[PDB]
Amino acid sequence: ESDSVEFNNAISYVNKIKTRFLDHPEIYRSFLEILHTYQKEQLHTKGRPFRGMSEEEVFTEVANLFRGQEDLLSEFGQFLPEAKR
């Protein structure tokens, strides 16, 4: 049947981000730009995947962009594989 629930959980998040940042159309540039430092790994090597950087940094930047809304970074925590509790 194929698992794409968590895909849609990502969609719903991005769509929420895009819907709340209507006053701020600029965030849609810089948000992903920061995660592009993360995601780079997959295309950077000629072989294995990596971690990118420290998961704390990619967080750190996005927080300054989004600032005021802690509830978004709450959902960001899903996409950070830490402990899972």
Partner: peptide
């Protein structure tokens, strides 16, 4: 279970393309 930050760049490019799909 593939919930990594990779999903955000996936969901973003997906959603960009989705708007353009919708117009027809």
């Amino acid at each position: 279970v593939r919930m990594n930050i990779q999903m955000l760049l996936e969901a973003a490019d997906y959603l960009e393309r989705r708007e353009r799909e919708a117009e027809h």
